[PDB]
Ligand binder design. Structure first.
Ligand SMILES: *Cc1c(C)c(=O)n2c(=O)c(C)c(C)n12
Ligand SMILES: [Mg+2]
Ligand SMILES: [Mg+2]
Ligand SMILES: [Mg+2]
Ligand SMILES: [Zn+2]
Ligand SMILES: [Zn+2]
Ligand SMILES: [Zn+2]
Ligand SMILES: [Zn+2]
Ligand SMILES: [Zn+2]
Ligand SMILES: [Zn+2]
Length: 308
């Protein structure tokens, strides 16, 4: 069998409370969070059940993906390597370990289904530049996979279950909000297809689920002076309610693939704050995490990228 590195990339999460400072310092481009912000972040991680389970999920996704890929075909033996953006093991650490282990050929995938120049493209550029610095190693990189039918089907089935679980009047008066992580609006000056891909995710999921009333929103924007992609899910929820009085809101943060603060808090608390305030029911179906259906979707994405 041909041996191939499987480079699984993701944002990264702190591994313990004491990593919060350095993690967010990395996110803030060297700017250490002020003490009140550090304390608030600790409170938030404690409120959603703790950091450790969150940090486990990328590991489980990569290892299940490796094993499942090695099981469903017989030509390639994959070895998974995790490269993270904002905490060790960094992308360059992962590429360097692949080089050390004798890997000469690798396929990479970012655990984010939509391409953007800010995230996926930069992950891929960092991996490929480390590989070319070290030499003797090439990487073929998945760039987007939001339209993989098995992944669409994951979210379609979750949405169908959520709508079927509703009371009749909720089911008749509900709103589906499909969201991804906001980015600076300036990405549009490069023709970044990220917004169009999020809209396409929302179209495909709503269509598959039979949900005719849905909206596209953004979440987790930063505070840079430049405008970020909007509307934010909080404002969009309040605004849609003020237009049409929906009694239930279903949040599908399709841009995220795992439980993390920006879902468990930014949706299950902040959006929940808004729905509770307007008297609407809140629903947020399970994130893919390392569930077998999602891992099979990722394995299909990888094998298709390799033309197998
Ligand atoms: C950490 C992280 C995740 C998971 C994600 O989707 N995004 C973004 O879009 C940014 C900008 C960052 C950071 N992250
Ligand atoms: Mg301790
Ligand atoms: Mg494509
Ligand atoms: Mg926020
Ligand atoms: Zn980032
Ligand atoms: Zn591992
Ligand atoms: Zn399997
Ligand atoms: Zn070397
Ligand atoms: Zn739109
Ligand atoms: Zn963020």
């Amino acid at each position: 069998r041909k041996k191939m590195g499987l480079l699984v990339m993701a944002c990264g999460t702190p591994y313990k409370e004491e990593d919060i400072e350095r993690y967010y310092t990395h996110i803030r481009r060297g700017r250490k969070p002020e003490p009140e912000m550090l304390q608030d972040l600790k409170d938030r991680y404690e409120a959603i059940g703790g950091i450790s389970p969150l940090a486990q999920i990328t590991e489980q996704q990569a290892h299940n993906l490796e094993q499942h890929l090695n099981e469903i075909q017989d030509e390639i033996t994959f070895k998974a390597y995790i490269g993270l953006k904002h905490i060790e093991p960094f992308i360059e650490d992962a590429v360097a370990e692949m080089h050390k282990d004798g890997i000469t050929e690798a396929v990479s995938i970012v655990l984010a289904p939509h391409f953007s120049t800010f995230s996926v493209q930069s992950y891929n550029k960092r991996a490929k530049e480390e590989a070319e610095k070290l030499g003797g190693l090439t990487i073929t990189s998945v760039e987007s996979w939001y339209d993989e039918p098995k992944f669409v089907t994951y979210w379609v089935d979750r949405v169908k279950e959520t709508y079927a679980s509703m009371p009749e009047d909720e089911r008749e008066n509900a709103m589906l909000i499909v969201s991804a992580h906001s980015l600076p609006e300036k990405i549009k000056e490069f023709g970044d297809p990220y917004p169009d891909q999020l809209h396409e995710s929302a179209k495909l999921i709503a269509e598959g689920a039979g949900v005719s009333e849905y909206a596209v929103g953004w979440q987790s924007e930063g505070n840079t002076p430049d405008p970020w992609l909007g509307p934010d899910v909080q404002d969009l929820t309040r605004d849609l309610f003020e237009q049409k009085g929906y009694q239930a809101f279903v949040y599908v943060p399709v841009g995220f693939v795992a439980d993390h603060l920006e879902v468990l808090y930014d949706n299950d608390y902040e959006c929940k704050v808004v729905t509770d305030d307007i008297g609407a029911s809140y629903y947020r179906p399970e994130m893919p995490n390392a569930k077998p259906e999602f891992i099979d979707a990722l394995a299909t994405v990888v094998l298709k990228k390799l033309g197998r």
